[PDB]
Amino acid sequence: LKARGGPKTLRRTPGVEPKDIRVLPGPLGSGNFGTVFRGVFKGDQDVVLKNAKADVMAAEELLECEMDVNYHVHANAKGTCARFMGCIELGAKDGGEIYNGTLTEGLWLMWANEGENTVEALMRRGTAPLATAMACADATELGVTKKAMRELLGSLARLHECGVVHRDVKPANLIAAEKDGGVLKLIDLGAAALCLPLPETLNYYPGDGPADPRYAKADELYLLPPGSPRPTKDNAAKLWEAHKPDRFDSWSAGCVMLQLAVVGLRTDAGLERFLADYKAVGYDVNAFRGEKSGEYGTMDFAALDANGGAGWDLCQRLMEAERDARASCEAALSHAFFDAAALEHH
Amino acid sequence: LKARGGPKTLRRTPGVEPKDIRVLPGPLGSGNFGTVFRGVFKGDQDVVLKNAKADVMAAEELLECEMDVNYHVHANAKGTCARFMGCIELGAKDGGEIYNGTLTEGLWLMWANEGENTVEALMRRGTAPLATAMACADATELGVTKKAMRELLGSLARLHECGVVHRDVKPANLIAAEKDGGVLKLIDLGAAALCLPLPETLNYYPGDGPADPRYAKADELYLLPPGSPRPTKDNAAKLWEAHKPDRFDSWSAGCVMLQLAVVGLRTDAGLERFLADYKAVGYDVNAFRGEKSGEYGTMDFAALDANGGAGWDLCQRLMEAERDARASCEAALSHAFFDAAALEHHHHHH
Numbered sequence: 054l055k056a057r058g059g060p061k062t063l064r065r066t067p068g069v070e071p072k073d074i075r076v077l078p079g080p081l082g083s084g085n086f087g088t089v090f091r092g093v094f095k096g097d098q099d100v101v102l103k104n105a106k107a108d109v110m111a112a113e114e115l116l117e118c119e120m121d122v123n124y125h126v127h128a129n130a131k132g133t134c135a136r137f138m139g140c141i142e143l144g145a146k147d148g149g150e151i152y153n154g155t156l157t158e159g160l161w162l163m164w165a166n167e168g169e170n171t172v173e174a175l176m177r178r179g180t181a182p183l184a185t186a187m188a189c190a191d192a193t194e195l196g197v198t199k200k201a202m203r204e205l206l207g208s209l210a211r212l213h214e215c216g217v218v219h220r221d222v223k224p225a226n227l228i229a230a231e232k233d234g235g236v237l238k239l240i241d242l243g244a245a246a247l248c249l250p251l252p253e254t255l256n257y258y259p260g261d262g263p264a265d266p267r268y269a270k271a272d273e274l275y276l277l278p279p280g281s282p283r284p285t286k287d288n289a290a291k292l293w294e295a296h297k298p299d300r301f302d303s304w305s306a307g308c309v310m311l312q313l314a315v316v317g318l319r320t321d322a323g324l325e326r327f328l329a330d331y332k333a334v335g336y337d338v339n340a341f342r343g344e345k346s347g348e349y350g351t352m353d354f355a356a357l358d359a360n361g362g363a364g365w366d367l368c369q370r371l372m373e374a375e376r377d378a379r380a381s382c383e384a385a386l387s388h389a390f391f392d393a394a395a396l397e398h399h
Numbered sequence: 400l401k402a403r404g405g406p407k408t409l410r411r412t413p414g415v416e417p418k419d420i421r422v423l424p425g426p427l428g429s430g431n432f433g434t435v436f437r438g439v440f441k442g443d444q445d446v447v448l449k450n451a452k453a454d455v456m457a458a459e460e461l462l463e464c465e466m467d468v469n470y471h472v473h474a475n476a477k478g479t480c481a482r483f484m485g486c487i488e489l490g491a492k493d494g495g496e497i498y499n500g501t502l503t504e505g506l507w508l509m510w511a512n513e514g515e516n517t518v519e520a521l522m523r524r525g526t527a528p529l530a531t532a533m534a535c536a537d538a539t540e541l542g543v544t545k546k547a548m549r550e551l552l553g554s555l556a557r558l559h560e561c562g563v564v565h566r567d568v569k570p571a572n573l574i575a576a577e578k579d580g581g582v583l584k585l586i587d588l589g590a591a592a593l594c595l596p597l598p599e600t601l602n603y604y605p606g607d608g609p610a611d612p613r614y615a616k617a618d619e620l621y622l623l624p625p626g627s628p629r630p631t632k633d634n635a636a637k638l639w640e641a642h643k644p645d646r647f648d649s650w651s652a653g654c655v656m657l658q659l660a661v662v663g664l665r666t667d668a669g670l671e672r673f674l675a676d677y678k679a680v681g682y683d684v685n686a687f688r689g690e691k692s693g694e695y696g697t698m699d700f701a702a703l704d705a706n707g708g709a710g711w712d713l714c715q716r717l718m719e720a721e722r723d724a725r726a727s728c729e730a731a732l733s734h735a736f737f738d739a740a741a742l743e744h745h746h747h748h749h
């Protein structure tokens with residue numbers, strides 16, 4: 054007697070059939086566990102597609118979690134991130150070839166193509182093309198920083214409200230969405246955690262996890278400290294208050310702000326130099342300004358200096374050494390930095 | 400008073416200056432922690448260049464370990480892997496732009512370009528193009544498997560002899576080196592460990608390190624099993640004998656053999672299907688043949704069947720469930736699979 058075969062179960066999104074998707078050859082890029090491609094959905098919709106790397110441990114499971122968090126965000130925080138269009142799962146026989154424009158075997162996630170340009174690419178081209186992409190009328194460091202940070206902090210606040218910590222906030226993961234007025238949208242929930250039981254936490258555990266070293270405080274690569282209890286439906290709220298995992302995003306947002314506000318900090322080496330000096334003076338912005346800024350003769354800190362040093366103060370709040378002292382993204386949003394100009398004389 | 404500052408320090412290899420390197424846009428590939436590009440050195444030497452990914456934690460440290468291991472291999476096991484040409488470190492102001500064909504800020508590693516096609520690429524195009532690339536006169540599955548495995552196992556034996564476990568053995572990390580008679584060379588020591596204190600172990604720790612699941616036994620994604628002693632100068636030799644981290648490479652080599660030997664196993668899905676069945680029958684090759692091979696009417700196991708099933712037996716040796724039973728790469732080399740046939744080549748022999 055031989056064991057019988059049986060059907061394969063495949064995950065599918067209503068309205069999305071494999072026949073509807075053409076994949077464009079050539080990866081947009083690759084992350085720790087997956088690869089991203091451009092595609093065309095139903096003949097005339099520009100989309101982006103992600104699959105799991107065949108050569109990476111647990112890649113499918115990592116992509117499944119990214120899927121779960123994408124559904125959560127789609128339901129609870131629309132507009133914060135690239136629009137999620139669901140998934141498509143293919144078997145081996147029915148898998149095609151990327152270079153021939155067809156989806157290969159495995160799980161694929163699909164989003165709208167929100168734009169060809171990331172904030173990292175734009176800022177490095179310059180403040181002008183960045184402002185243009187963002188539809189930002191004040192095409193200065195201060196202007197783009199105000200608009201971008203209001204949008205970023207607003208979106209992070211909404212994500213945190215529904216229990217999601219993004220965990221990979223940085224210019225490379227922001228797109229100025231031209232079809233939506235240039236507003237910034239986050240991408241890449243590949244490292245995101247769901248930190249409340251809805252119905253269960255996801256990708257949320259004690260100890261260090263994936264982090265971009267440029268945008269994570271070097272001694273804080275965790276959402277929950279290594280000593281923390283494992284999260285459960287019963288202790289999740291307590292852990293959120295105790296360990297403030299959302300403050301991981303706050304620090305990253307501060308890094309974004311520094312790069313938007315100061316042209317010389319837009320290279321990796323530039324921001325790295327700043328953060329090393331910032332740590333050296335005890336994560337004290339005023340100490341940096343007094344002891345270190347004189348060393349930065351090739352840079353212009355005017356955007357941070359403006360209006361009683363409002364920008365510096367906001368960076369300080371977002372980048373306090375201690376999480377318990379560090380501003381939430383919601384609180385940061387109410388900062389003087391974002392105040393409307395008084396008496397504009399129209 | 401003001402702090403005085405001072406010069407930057409940059410790592411360099413004598414005879415290799417960044418002005419002499421042109422980088423070609425378009426990553427050749429990207430792994431877990433780095434990105435590889437084609438380059439041209441001194442206007443006419445085809446090279447390959449690797450830097451760290453800026454977005455990956457400690458990619459910097461991983462690239463440094465890859466560098467160290469490459470220096471070790473260059474000194475102790477020449478010809479086993481792509482020829483290592485050294486490092487080039489660039490600073491901020493002297494750093495360039497990939498689009499301008501210049502090396503960017505940070506540490507770079509450089510190797511000779513050993514060939515445009517990997518064994519993975521070749522085998523999937525067919526045994527014929529693979530055999531041609533390997534200069535393999537016997538252009539059959541058996542022929543290419545014999546020649547490739549002799550070369551691979553020989554090189555793994557040399558690497559293990561100098562304390563190095565490659566940890567990423569697979570067809571994608573083998574190149575048939577056109578300029579050295581088609582002989583296979585390993586690439587990508589990015590996951591490699593130096594497992595002996597020479598003078599210090601490198602990238603060697605208990606627990607599931609990086610592993611390509613296709614080429615790693617599902618429950619053996621480690622070199623050293625967790626909890627077991629952290630590697631130190633005086634427990635190193637002990638751990639080598641006890642946990643046999645080199646047998647990680649043995650299993651991978653078995654996977655390579657399966658794909659070389661059986662065309663149907665050259666796809667990810669094909670090899671995956673086989674290993675699942677192999678696991679299902681208790682990692683017993685004869686049981687697979689007896690209970691399962693009837694389900695593989697799509698495929699041809701002739702290369703493994705040949706000569707009293709010598710190929711099957713070598714696979715069994717390289718792929719024992721238990722490391723304590725699994726052949727070393729050195730031991731595998733003397734297997735009957737590699738024997739010359741009686742009177743082989745008699746018709747032209749002098």
Ligand SMILES: Nc1ncnc2c1ncn2[C@@H]1O[C@H](COP(=O)(O)OP(=O)(O)O)[C@@H](O)[C@H]1O
Nearest residue numbers: 081082083084089101135164165166167168240
């Ligand atoms: N929804 C989207 N719309 C437009 N572009 C996207 C979207 N999602 C991802 N991308 C792009 O896909 C790419 C992913 O590549 P990335 O992770 O940066 O690879 P690497 O780390 O090798 O640079 C990024 O350039 C990103 O801008």
Ligand SMILES: Nc1ncnc2c1ncn2[C@@H]1O[C@H](COP(=O)(O)OP(=O)(O)O)[C@@H](O)[C@H]1O
Nearest residue numbers: 427428429430447481510511512513514571586
């Ligand atoms: N020394 C070398 N000579 C020629 N090609 C090389 C060398 N080192 C690396 N490469 C090529 O660089 C590429 C790295 O790509 P990667 O994504 O790391 O692996 P994969 O082939 O699994 O995608 C490989 O295609 C490999 O053939």
Ligand SMILES: [Mg+2]
Nearest residue numbers: 359360361394
């Ligand atoms: Mg003012």
Ligand SMILES: [Mg+2]
Nearest residue numbers: 321322453505
């Ligand atoms: Mg760098």
